Write a protein that binds this DNA or RNA. Structure first.
Ligand SMILES: [Fe+2]
Ligand SMILES: [Zn+2]
Length: 349
RNA sequence: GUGU
């Protein structure tokens, strides 16, 4: 039993072309796409005003196609899961830092998270690495000045995600920039012939945060974008796949994986417990996470009886299935935090 | 990597 998953590199606002490409493959080969995974640079600009939050060179200050899907003019034909890259409507993603649908069939995984679909556990890490921002908190509501920093990956995602392969393996992990040093684990000589600009970076190319997460979780697959080129490599048991940008040949590939059972997009139980147990570090909605707390210390208080009660209350107030909600994004920010706070306090810890 |  087989499922076919499309994996996409950078989209840069070219959604109609991406779905056209994807519908072609469905018609040409007769295979059915279960769902789509995109590794970032999604540019989910709702309308003109969101352009202030898109950090691009001036020639790329363009709306793209997403507003068509946001308005309902277009309908995304497949469920599309994505992380954020360095070219985003960063204000929208911060409202949805705990994940959410930006429009029908288009689900943002958040700053980081794990989801369940078709028996698979999928971990996403948004953004790109800059050492000088990796300790900065998020400030909310988003203001135009943070356009330059909102999409930089924070070190704290390492502690949020590190326990996630205790119960079971991670099937797929996504990141926008490559895990640092993985460039050396494939045919880099051939890669340097197509991208001679990479050679000077050596093994330091890529994000150290993603390197750590890769080494800790060892997913079956790690997918990244951002470098506008195809690449493959193997780090121990992990198959690494880098993808190009929509418009070129190397932008889309497909994973044909065993389908254990067909199952709708669901929240991951272990992620949900991590989210509830770290609530104290996130409780100040003007600035989070409060790193005076230890994320690891907070997560060390997880127990099997608390996990069971957390998932019971999550199913009650939110539900295990991830379902489309068309409230505005600032309301979704407040609502999801309202139930995390409520669930935590009901634990009396 | 259209990366500061
Ligand atoms: Fe990028
Ligand atoms: Zn890109």
């Amino acid at each position: 039993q087989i499922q076919h998953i499309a994996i996409v590199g950078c989209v840069h606002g070219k959604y109609r072309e991406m779905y056209r490409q994807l519908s072609e493959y469905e018609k040409s080969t007769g295979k059915e796409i279960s769902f789509v995974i995109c590794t970032g640079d999604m540019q989910t600009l709702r309308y003109e005003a969101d352009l202030v939050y898109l950090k691009v060179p001036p020639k790329y200050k363009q709306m793209g196609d997403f507003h068509l899907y946001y308005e309902g003019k277009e309908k995304a034909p497949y469920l599309t899961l994505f992380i954020g890259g360095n070219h985003e409507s960063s204000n929208v993603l911060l409202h949805l830092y705990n994940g959410g649908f930006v429009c029908f069939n288009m689900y943002y995984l958040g700053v980081c998270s794990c989801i369940n679909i078709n028996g698979l556990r999928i971990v996403g890490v948004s953004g790109i690495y800059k050492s000088f921002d990796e300790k900065k908190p998020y400030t909310y509501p988003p203001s135009p000045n943070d356009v330059v920093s909102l999409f930089h990956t924070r070190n704290y995602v390492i502690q949020m995600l590190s326990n996630l392969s205790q119960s079971s393996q991670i099937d797929i992990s996504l990141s926008h920039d490559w895990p640092q040093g993985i460039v050396m684990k494939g045919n880099y000589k051939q890669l340097y012939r197509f991208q001679p600009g990479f050679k000077k970076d050596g093994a330091s190319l890529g994000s150290p945060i993603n390197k750590v997460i890769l080494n800790t979780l060892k997913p079956k697959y790690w997918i990244s974008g951002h470098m506008h080129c195809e690449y493959h490599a193997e780090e121990g048991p992990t198959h690494f796949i880098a993808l190009g940008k929509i418009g070129y040949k190397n932008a889309i590939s497909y994973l044909d994986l065993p389908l254990k059972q067909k199952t709708d997009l669901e929240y991951d139980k272990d992620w949900v417990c991590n989210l509830i147990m770290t609530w104290p570090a996130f409780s100040n909605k003007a600035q989070f996470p409060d790193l005076s707390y230890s994320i690891s210390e907070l997560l060390s208080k997880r127990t099997k009886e608390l996990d069971k009660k957390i998932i019971e209350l999550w199913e009650k107030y939110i539900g295990l299935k991830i379902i489309y909600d068309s409230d505005t994004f600032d309301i979704q920010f407040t609502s999801r935090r309202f139930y995390i706070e409520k669930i935590y306090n009901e634990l009396n810890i």
